[PDB]
Amino acid sequence: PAVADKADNAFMMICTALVLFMTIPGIALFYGGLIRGKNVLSMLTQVTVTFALVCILWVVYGYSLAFGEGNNFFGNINWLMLKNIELTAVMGSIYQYIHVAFQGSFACITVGLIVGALAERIRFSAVLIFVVVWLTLSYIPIAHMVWGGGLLASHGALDFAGGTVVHINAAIAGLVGAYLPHNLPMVFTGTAILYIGWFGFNAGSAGTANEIAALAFVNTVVATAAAILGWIFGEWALRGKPSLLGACSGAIAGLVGVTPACGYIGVGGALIIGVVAGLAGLWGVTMPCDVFGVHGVCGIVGCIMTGIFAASSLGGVGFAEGVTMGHQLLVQLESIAITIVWSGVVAFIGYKLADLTVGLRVP
Amino acid sequence: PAVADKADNAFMMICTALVLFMTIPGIALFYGGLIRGKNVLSMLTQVTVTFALVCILWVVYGYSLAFGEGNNFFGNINWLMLKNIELTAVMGSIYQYIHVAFQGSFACITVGLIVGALAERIRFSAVLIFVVVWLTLSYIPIAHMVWGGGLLASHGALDFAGGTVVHINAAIAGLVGAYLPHNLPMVFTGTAILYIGWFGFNAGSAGTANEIAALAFVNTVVATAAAILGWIFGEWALRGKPSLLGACSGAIAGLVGVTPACGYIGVGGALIIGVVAGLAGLWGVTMPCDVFGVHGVCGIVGCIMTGIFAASSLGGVGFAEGVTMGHQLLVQLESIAITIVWSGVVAFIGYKLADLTVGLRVP
Amino acid sequence: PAVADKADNAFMMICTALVLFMTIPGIALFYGGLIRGKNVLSMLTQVTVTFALVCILWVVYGYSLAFGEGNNFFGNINWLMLKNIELTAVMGSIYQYIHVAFQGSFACITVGLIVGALAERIRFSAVLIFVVVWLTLSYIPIAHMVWGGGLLASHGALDFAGGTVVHINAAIAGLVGAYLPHNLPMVFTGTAILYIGWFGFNAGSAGTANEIAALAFVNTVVATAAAILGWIFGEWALRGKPSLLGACSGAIAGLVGVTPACGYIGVGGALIIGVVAGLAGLWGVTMPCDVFGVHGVCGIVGCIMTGIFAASSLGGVGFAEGVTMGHQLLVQLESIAITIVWSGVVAFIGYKLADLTVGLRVP
């Protein structure tokens, strides 16, 4: 019977704290510097309260429905309040309780991304309703499909740290909501906290302190740097000079782009993905809700590029046996399409339920 | 002879840095946003200088007096400047030097809690005198009694991370002192740093990256979330709406409440303790010194509830052999009573000595 | 063949993230609170973009030239884009990829120290040119000479975490540049982030979570505290009262001073080095570019004192076999002299090349 490795337990608990740091206070500060001053306090309150709500829903039934064994779309209700999970139960090479906390931290940042941007325009009670509906019917099934042995995983979709589950998923929810900077030092500080926490997000996705965690770590450093330079170069070419917001946006573009690819590509691949993501991000915003443009565009770019750069010939770890680059690409595209439609439909349902119960627009 | 486990060494060094982060700059920013603007610089200076003083006193004689073998109340002077502690000496499953640093970080946050709140009203030299007296005669003996094999531990008191040693101890010292918000984004940032650092505080209290550290980690996430919701719900019911300060206070209430219980209870217990702590905290402040109301009330609530929720039947790790819930409860109450009187008496002595030497009230 | 230790892999990846945290956002916030308000945005942009540039240069050829085998001054070009480094290659007791990231993080903070201070006065394109020249011809060779088996290491120079490679190297580059506070809460926050990240910087320099990492950790706590008190005492004696900037400067003085010594001295040595560094730092500034006075003076003081306190008789780990204190002192002095001249010459070349190509002074 599988035994827990204390080095992996230590690494994973610290990586979980780093991911939690991305929301509290990372994302809150990022949006806090971007949105109007008069709306900052309310947004910080909404991010904090919804963060709490996600943590509770996760332990009550979220983890069980996302990671329990069930079908292609949902898990089960056998792990309600973590019932039936022995304290010494092992998942991979770490205690399952750590896996519960790590996975929960990803649900939290995904929700923080959406709430932080929409807090300005949405009624408090309406956001709570939306979070409950969307976490339960979008985040949970998509996590199950991708990381819980569901539909996408069973077709061999590659998404190391959440290009689909986190980025595209949140970007679409934010964009559906949108359809329905007073402090740049604060934006920079939030970006910096997101970047440092992202090492736990990306490297921790290996589930162990091995060579894949090391690869994801280095690729995170490289893609982020390449994206900062790509964005800044585009900014200098199009606007005549770099800007602080541009530099921070480029960092996020690279972080998002490398998210699905970090544990599968070589450093050359990380550099290319970083540059392309930084430029795509800049193109995206050119064509606080702009954040959904960066997470959306860059998440799609990253997910597609994972299907290319995972190739051995391109310095990647290699595709699964019997899988051509062409096949992996189709699988990546299908995963992206499914995430977009699934998240969009659920988000629409969430916003509509809130609007029909308490009303959407801030009173 | 006991050998050090490198995974535990790594986990404990990182947890120590996280606890140090709680003081520098966590607590300083929390108070920095709460106190009057004109007093911020002075308070930050006092927190930094007293933090330095604690670090030095700890290494010179503090660690030895708190953790050396002695009697029910004090250790000894055999580890002055860490003399006689071999570099390769092991304490538990980690090098003793790491145990020295981890334990020292708890002394630092306890003192930061007191200094941050009272800096506005106390003379610089008077706070230095108070810190010396109170750390030496209150923090050290209480740490020894609870975690150094002293009186309370010998009676089987349960206090995983310091409901008594840190929270009640500091709350009473602060309240004795009191008897004798200009920047809410800053308060939120300090709260967030305290929360992230608290994973090192709570999970690191296991002394190893095992299933107890994992349990404490998950319970920290759960109790904090439950407290945020409990406080916010009470706020909505009593005031008509949540507030950012309420959300941050609820987070601290849950963190404090779960501190003594985190490594002994089940997640159901963590949820209940979190909700009760959040509500008790709100009731407490209703009836910057208010922080002592939260740490005091919530520390007491947490310490008492540990004596209930540690029970196997309630999902806890179970009480010691031959100990009924009733017995544990009496032991918890006795530990609380002793901490309150001990800290109160020493604090009074400390403030009086400062007042008789240099004068208390800021000149 | 050497195998990777997962505990060391975990510790080193987390220490690397902590070092990265020192630059992003540590150093940026430290300078951000010190420099004029009108120059803050530009400085934050320059620190971020140059951080990205360093990350990319490091992976493309930097790591290979600094850590590959070559001669007394430079490595080689056999590790371009990390080519020829197997994903599972081990360096010491960790995967080589982690060693690449850890080493890269030191290059980043060294450059951040220089850019943050000079951003106010230098043209954007001129700083990029300077960084390329100076990282390539000063940071890389000095790192190779000290930590890559080059000239200084081959003569037994002691420099645990970079008194020469980082501190003196950057201080001289900054001073050559100089020759050619609006937000103290922000300065305090940057200092706090630098301090917490410094545990990864100092303890991670052991390359493993062993007793030397524990020693460096404790010495970091002690020297920092002793320096804060030494500076503050001098400030009280010379100016009549402590100040927040003084307390933060004292912390940095102790951190810099203990950098070369942390893994070689006893806690008594750390206390003495801390006090002397805090006082030397205060004397230095008395006689944002003042930061180069602290890193320069304190780096020299630390490097010299390592040659004294590494002695067994003084509680240190002991000098190499057959090396007297007198010999080690000469070696420390020679290493300091070489670092100063090497960095100064290259910096002058860098600034001149930029001035001849795009012009130095901000347009």
mmCIF file of all heavy atoms in Angstrom, chain B residues 1-36:
data_model
loop_
_atom_site.group_PDB
_atom_site.id
_atom_site.type_symbol
_atom_site.label_atom_id
_atom_site.label_comp_id
_atom_site.label_asym_id
_atom_site.label_seq_id
_atom_site.Cartn_x
_atom_site.Cartn_y
_atom_site.Cartn_z
ATOM 1 N N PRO B 1 20.792 6.683 18.482
ATOM 2 C CA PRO B 1 20.597 8.122 18.688
ATOM 3 C C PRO B 1 19.793 8.765 17.548
ATOM 4 O O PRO B 1 20.114 8.549 16.372
ATOM 5 C CB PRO B 1 22.031 8.669 18.726
ATOM 6 C CG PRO B 1 22.896 7.614 18.031
ATOM 7 C CD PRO B 1 22.057 6.382 17.786
ATOM 8 N N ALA B 2 18.759 9.534 17.908
ATOM 9 C CA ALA B 2 17.870 10.224 16.945
ATOM 10 C C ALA B 2 18.603 10.948 15.812
ATOM 11 O O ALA B 2 19.564 11.680 16.050
ATOM 12 C CB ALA B 2 16.931 11.188 17.669
ATOM 13 N N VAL B 3 18.142 10.717 14.583
ATOM 14 C CA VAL B 3 18.727 11.325 13.384
ATOM 15 C C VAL B 3 17.740 12.328 12.771
ATOM 16 O O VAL B 3 16.518 12.146 12.861
ATOM 17 C CB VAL B 3 19.194 10.242 12.354
ATOM 18 C CG1 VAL B 3 18.028 9.367 11.897
ATOM 19 C CG2 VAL B 3 19.899 10.870 11.158
ATOM 20 N N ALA B 4 18.267 13.405 12.189
ATOM 21 C CA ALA B 4 17.416 14.430 11.588
ATOM 22 C C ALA B 4 16.866 13.977 10.238
ATOM 23 O O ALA B 4 17.574 13.343 9.451
ATOM 24 C CB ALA B 4 18.189 15.746 11.433
ATOM 25 N N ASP B 5 15.604 14.305 9.983
ATOM 26 C CA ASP B 5 14.966 13.966 8.722
ATOM 27 C C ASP B 5 15.016 15.252 7.890
ATOM 28 O O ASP B 5 14.490 16.286 8.298
ATOM 29 C CB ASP B 5 13.529 13.479 8.953
ATOM 30 C CG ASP B 5 12.805 13.144 7.662
ATOM 31 O OD1 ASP B 5 12.595 14.054 6.845
ATOM 32 O OD2 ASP B 5 12.424 11.973 7.466
ATOM 33 N N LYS B 6 15.682 15.192 6.744
ATOM 34 C CA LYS B 6 15.837 16.380 5.878
ATOM 35 C C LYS B 6 14.525 16.983 5.402
ATOM 36 O O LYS B 6 14.460 18.193 5.206
ATOM 37 C CB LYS B 6 16.768 16.095 4.706
ATOM 38 C CG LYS B 6 18.231 15.987 5.132
ATOM 39 C CD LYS B 6 19.024 15.170 4.133
ATOM 40 C CE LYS B 6 19.608 16.039 3.078
ATOM 41 N NZ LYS B 6 20.321 15.269 2.006
ATOM 42 N N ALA B 7 13.494 16.150 5.225
ATOM 43 C CA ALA B 7 12.170 16.647 4.795
ATOM 44 C C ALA B 7 11.576 17.509 5.909
ATOM 45 O O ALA B 7 10.974 18.562 5.645
ATOM 46 C CB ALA B 7 11.243 15.484 4.485
ATOM 47 N N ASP B 8 11.750 17.054 7.152
ATOM 48 C CA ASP B 8 11.260 17.778 8.317
ATOM 49 C C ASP B 8 12.097 19.042 8.539
ATOM 50 O O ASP B 8 11.541 20.077 8.890
ATOM 51 C CB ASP B 8 11.239 16.883 9.568
ATOM 52 C CG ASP B 8 10.219 15.743 9.460
ATOM 53 O OD1 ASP B 8 9.230 15.850 8.692
ATOM 54 O OD2 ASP B 8 10.414 14.719 10.143
ATOM 55 N N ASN B 9 13.411 18.960 8.312
ATOM 56 C CA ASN B 9 14.300 20.131 8.437
ATOM 57 C C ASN B 9 13.840 21.229 7.453
ATOM 58 O O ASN B 9 13.748 22.403 7.813
ATOM 59 C CB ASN B 9 15.760 19.793 8.075
ATOM 60 C CG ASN B 9 16.490 18.989 9.147
ATOM 61 O OD1 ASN B 9 16.125 19.007 10.315
ATOM 62 N ND2 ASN B 9 17.544 18.277 8.737
ATOM 63 N N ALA B 10 13.571 20.824 6.212
ATOM 64 C CA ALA B 10 13.126 21.743 5.142
ATOM 65 C C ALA B 10 11.784 22.373 5.496
ATOM 66 O O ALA B 10 11.620 23.596 5.440
ATOM 67 C CB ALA B 10 13.005 20.974 3.810
ATOM 68 N N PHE B 11 10.821 21.526 5.864
ATOM 69 C CA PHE B 11 9.488 21.984 6.232
ATOM 70 C C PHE B 11 9.533 22.985 7.391
ATOM 71 O O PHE B 11 8.872 24.031 7.348
ATOM 72 C CB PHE B 11 8.631 20.775 6.638
ATOM 73 C CG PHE B 11 7.214 21.115 6.969
ATOM 74 C CD1 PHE B 11 6.379 21.691 6.014
ATOM 75 C CD2 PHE B 11 6.700 20.840 8.242
ATOM 76 C CE1 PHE B 11 5.038 22.006 6.323
ATOM 77 C CE2 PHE B 11 5.373 21.137 8.556
ATOM 78 C CZ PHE B 11 4.538 21.723 7.587
ATOM 79 N N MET B 12 10.296 22.646 8.427
ATOM 80 C CA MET B 12 10.411 23.481 9.644
ATOM 81 C C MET B 12 11.149 24.807 9.448
ATOM 82 O O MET B 12 10.787 25.815 10.063
ATOM 83 C CB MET B 12 10.950 22.644 10.818
ATOM 84 C CG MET B 12 9.933 21.526 11.262
ATOM 85 S SD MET B 12 8.289 22.221 11.706
ATOM 86 C CE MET B 12 8.769 23.285 13.068
ATOM 87 N N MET B 13 12.165 24.815 8.592
ATOM 88 C CA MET B 13 12.864 26.068 8.273
ATOM 89 C C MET B 13 11.904 26.982 7.481
ATOM 90 O O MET B 13 11.810 28.175 7.763
ATOM 91 C CB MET B 13 14.152 25.828 7.490
ATOM 92 C CG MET B 13 15.316 25.423 8.405
ATOM 93 S SD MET B 13 16.893 25.312 7.538
ATOM 94 C CE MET B 13 16.648 23.742 6.681
ATOM 95 N N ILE B 14 11.180 26.423 6.518
ATOM 96 C CA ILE B 14 10.223 27.228 5.745
ATOM 97 C C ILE B 14 9.057 27.701 6.671
ATOM 98 O O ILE B 14 8.611 28.855 6.583
ATOM 99 C CB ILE B 14 9.673 26.494 4.491
ATOM 100 C CG1 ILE B 14 10.800 26.110 3.498
ATOM 101 C CG2 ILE B 14 8.597 27.358 3.783
ATOM 102 C CD1 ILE B 14 11.800 27.241 3.159
ATOM 103 N N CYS B 15 8.577 26.826 7.553
ATOM 104 C CA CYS B 15 7.501 27.227 8.475
ATOM 105 C C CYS B 15 7.969 28.359 9.386
ATOM 106 O O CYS B 15 7.186 29.253 9.688
ATOM 107 C CB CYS B 15 6.991 26.047 9.311
ATOM 108 S SG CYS B 15 5.952 24.909 8.371
ATOM 109 N N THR B 16 9.242 28.328 9.802
ATOM 110 C CA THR B 16 9.807 29.371 10.672
ATOM 111 C C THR B 16 9.823 30.719 9.936
ATOM 112 O O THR B 16 9.467 31.767 10.520
ATOM 113 C CB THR B 16 11.247 29.025 11.132
ATOM 114 O OG1 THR B 16 11.212 27.805 11.880
ATOM 115 C CG2 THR B 16 11.826 30.143 12.016
ATOM 116 N N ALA B 17 10.240 30.698 8.667
ATOM 117 C CA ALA B 17 10.263 31.927 7.860
ATOM 118 C C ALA B 17 8.817 32.462 7.733
ATOM 119 O O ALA B 17 8.589 33.674 7.803
ATOM 120 C CB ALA B 17 10.891 31.687 6.464
ATOM 121 N N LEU B 18 7.855 31.559 7.550
ATOM 122 C CA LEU B 18 6.441 31.961 7.466
ATOM 123 C C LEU B 18 5.974 32.615 8.777
ATOM 124 O O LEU B 18 5.261 33.624 8.753
ATOM 125 C CB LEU B 18 5.561 30.757 7.124
ATOM 126 C CG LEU B 18 5.597 30.378 5.634
ATOM 127 C CD1 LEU B 18 4.926 29.014 5.413
ATOM 128 C CD2 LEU B 18 4.962 31.483 4.747
ATOM 129 N N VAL B 19 6.385 32.067 9.919
ATOM 130 C CA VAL B 19 6.003 32.676 11.214
ATOM 131 C C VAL B 19 6.677 34.052 11.368
ATOM 132 O O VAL B 19 6.066 35.022 11.845
ATOM 133 C CB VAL B 19 6.319 31.764 12.409
ATOM 134 C CG1 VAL B 19 5.924 32.468 13.730
ATOM 135 C CG2 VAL B 19 5.523 30.434 12.297
ATOM 136 N N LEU B 20 7.939 34.147 10.982
ATOM 137 C CA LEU B 20 8.648 35.436 11.047
ATOM 138 C C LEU B 20 7.928 36.498 10.164
ATOM 139 O O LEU B 20 7.849 37.681 10.532
ATOM 140 C CB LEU B 20 10.112 35.271 10.646
ATOM 141 C CG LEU B 20 10.972 34.465 11.649
ATOM 142 C CD1 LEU B 20 12.374 34.255 11.067
ATOM 143 C CD2 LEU B 20 11.053 35.178 13.002
ATOM 144 N N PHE B 21 7.407 36.046 9.022
ATOM 145 C CA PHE B 21 6.642 36.872 8.048
ATOM 146 C C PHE B 21 5.378 37.458 8.741
ATOM 147 O O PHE B 21 4.968 38.581 8.449
ATOM 148 C CB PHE B 21 6.284 35.946 6.879
ATOM 149 C CG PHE B 21 5.704 36.618 5.638
ATOM 150 C CD1 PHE B 21 6.114 37.871 5.207
ATOM 151 C CD2 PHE B 21 4.782 35.910 4.856
ATOM 152 C CE1 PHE B 21 5.587 38.436 4.025
ATOM 153 C CE2 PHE B 21 4.260 36.456 3.672
ATOM 154 C CZ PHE B 21 4.670 37.709 3.258
ATOM 155 N N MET B 22 4.785 36.701 9.666
ATOM 156 C CA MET B 22 3.603 37.168 10.424
ATOM 157 C C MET B 22 3.894 38.456 11.186
ATOM 158 O O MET B 22 3.025 39.314 11.292
ATOM 159 C CB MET B 22 3.131 36.106 11.418
ATOM 160 C CG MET B 22 2.583 34.859 10.722
ATOM 161 S SD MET B 22 2.197 33.546 11.903
ATOM 162 C CE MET B 22 0.673 34.181 12.627
ATOM 163 N N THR B 23 5.109 38.591 11.720
ATOM 164 C CA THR B 23 5.487 39.813 12.455
ATOM 165 C C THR B 23 6.017 40.862 11.479
ATOM 166 O O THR B 23 5.580 42.022 11.486
ATOM 167 C CB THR B 23 6.584 39.540 13.546
ATOM 168 O OG1 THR B 23 6.140 38.523 14.449
ATOM 169 C CG2 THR B 23 6.958 40.812 14.354
ATOM 170 N N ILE B 24 6.984 40.446 10.666
ATOM 171 C CA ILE B 24 7.661 41.318 9.708
ATOM 172 C C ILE B 24 7.297 40.896 8.275
ATOM 173 O O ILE B 24 7.917 39.978 7.720
ATOM 174 C CB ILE B 24 9.225 41.280 9.983
ATOM 175 C CG1 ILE B 24 9.538 41.607 11.464
ATOM 176 C CG2 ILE B 24 10.033 42.174 9.008
ATOM 177 C CD1 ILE B 24 9.229 43.093 11.923
ATOM 178 N N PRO B 25 6.306 41.579 7.656
ATOM 179 C CA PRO B 25 5.600 42.777 8.135
ATOM 180 C C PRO B 25 4.125 42.605 8.541
ATOM 181 O O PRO B 25 3.454 43.616 8.773
ATOM 182 C CB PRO B 25 5.600 43.640 6.867
ATOM 183 C CG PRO B 25 5.303 42.583 5.753
ATOM 184 C CD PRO B 25 5.870 41.243 6.282
ATOM 185 N N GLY B 26 3.615 41.373 8.556
ATOM 186 C CA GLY B 26 2.205 41.084 8.861
ATOM 187 C C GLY B 26 1.506 41.929 9.919
ATOM 188 O O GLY B 26 0.618 42.734 9.611
ATOM 189 N N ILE B 27 1.894 41.732 11.174
ATOM 190 C CA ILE B 27 1.279 42.461 12.288
ATOM 191 C C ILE B 27 1.498 43.969 12.207
ATOM 192 O O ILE B 27 0.618 44.761 12.598
ATOM 193 C CB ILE B 27 1.707 41.873 13.692
ATOM 194 C CG1 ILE B 27 0.705 42.258 14.792
ATOM 195 C CG2 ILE B 27 3.130 42.299 14.097
ATOM 196 C CD1 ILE B 27 -0.703 41.648 14.625
ATOM 197 N N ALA B 28 2.660 44.370 11.700
ATOM 198 C CA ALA B 28 2.987 45.799 11.576
ATOM 199 C C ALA B 28 2.041 46.498 10.598
ATOM 200 O O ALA B 28 1.605 47.636 10.843
ATOM 201 C CB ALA B 28 4.440 45.985 11.153
ATOM 202 N N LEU B 29 1.720 45.814 9.499
ATOM 203 C CA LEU B 29 0.799 46.365 8.486
ATOM 204 C C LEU B 29 -0.647 46.347 8.974
ATOM 205 O O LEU B 29 -1.420 47.259 8.669
ATOM 206 C CB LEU B 29 0.912 45.599 7.164
ATOM 207 C CG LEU B 29 2.244 45.803 6.409
ATOM 208 C CD1 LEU B 29 2.250 44.995 5.106
ATOM 209 C CD2 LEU B 29 2.532 47.276 6.136
ATOM 210 N N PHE B 30 -1.006 45.301 9.711
ATOM 211 C CA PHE B 30 -2.359 45.166 10.259
ATOM 212 C C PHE B 30 -2.646 46.385 11.159
ATOM 213 O O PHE B 30 -3.632 47.118 10.962
ATOM 214 C CB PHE B 30 -2.487 43.847 11.027
ATOM 215 C CG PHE B 30 -3.869 43.611 11.589
ATOM 216 C CD1 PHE B 30 -4.849 42.978 10.822
ATOM 217 C CD2 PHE B 30 -4.194 44.037 12.883
ATOM 218 C CE1 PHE B 30 -6.145 42.768 11.331
ATOM 219 C CE2 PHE B 30 -5.484 43.830 13.406
ATOM 220 C CZ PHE B 30 -6.460 43.194 12.632
ATOM 221 N N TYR B 31 -1.758 46.623 12.121
ATOM 222 C CA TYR B 31 -1.907 47.784 13.010
ATOM 223 C C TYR B 31 -1.676 49.084 12.266
ATOM 224 O O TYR B 31 -2.325 50.098 12.552
ATOM 225 C CB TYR B 31 -0.941 47.705 14.181
ATOM 226 C CG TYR B 31 -1.375 46.735 15.237
ATOM 227 C CD1 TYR B 31 -0.554 45.673 15.609
ATOM 228 C CD2 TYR B 31 -2.602 46.887 15.885
ATOM 229 C CE1 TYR B 31 -0.937 44.783 16.602
ATOM 230 C CE2 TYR B 31 -3.007 45.990 16.871
ATOM 231 C CZ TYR B 31 -2.166 44.940 17.221
ATOM 232 O OH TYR B 31 -2.546 44.052 18.200
ATOM 233 N N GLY B 32 -0.748 49.060 11.315
ATOM 234 C CA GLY B 32 -0.436 50.254 10.529
ATOM 235 C C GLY B 32 -1.638 50.848 9.820
ATOM 236 O O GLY B 32 -1.705 52.059 9.629
ATOM 237 N N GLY B 33 -2.585 50.005 9.409
ATOM 238 C CA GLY B 33 -3.773 50.503 8.725
ATOM 239 C C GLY B 33 -4.872 50.913 9.691
ATOM 240 O O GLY B 33 -5.757 51.694 9.336
ATOM 241 N N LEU B 34 -4.813 50.368 10.907
ATOM 242 C CA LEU B 34 -5.800 50.628 11.963
ATOM 243 C C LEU B 34 -5.569 51.875 12.800
ATOM 244 O O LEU B 34 -6.521 52.567 13.162
ATOM 245 C CB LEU B 34 -5.861 49.447 12.930
ATOM 246 C CG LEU B 34 -6.625 48.180 12.570
ATOM 247 C CD1 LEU B 34 -6.500 47.207 13.735
ATOM 248 C CD2 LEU B 34 -8.092 48.484 12.260
ATOM 249 N N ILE B 35 -4.317 52.133 13.158
ATOM 250 C CA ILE B 35 -4.003 53.285 14.001
ATOM 251 C C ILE B 35 -3.952 54.582 13.218
ATOM 252 O O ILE B 35 -3.887 54.574 11.988
ATOM 253 C CB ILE B 35 -2.701 53.058 14.809
ATOM 254 C CG1 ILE B 35 -1.471 53.154 13.896
ATOM 255 C CG2 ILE B 35 -2.758 51.705 15.540
ATOM 256 C CD1 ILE B 35 -0.166 52.996 14.616
ATOM 257 N N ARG B 36 -3.987 55.699 13.943
ATOM 258 C CA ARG B 36 -3.940 57.023 13.350
ATOM 259 C C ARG B 36 -2.661 57.192 12.522
ATOM 260 O O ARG B 36 -1.591 56.730 12.927
ATOM 261 C CB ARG B 36 -4.037 58.085 14.455
ATOM 262 C CG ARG B 36 -4.013 59.513 13.974
ATOM 263 C CD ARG B 36 -5.380 60.019 13.538
ATOM 264 N NE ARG B 36 -6.210 60.418 14.672
ATOM 265 C CZ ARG B 36 -7.113 61.394 14.634
ATOM 266 N NH1 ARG B 36 -7.302 62.090 13.518
ATOM 267 N NH2 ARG B 36 -7.823 61.684 15.715
#
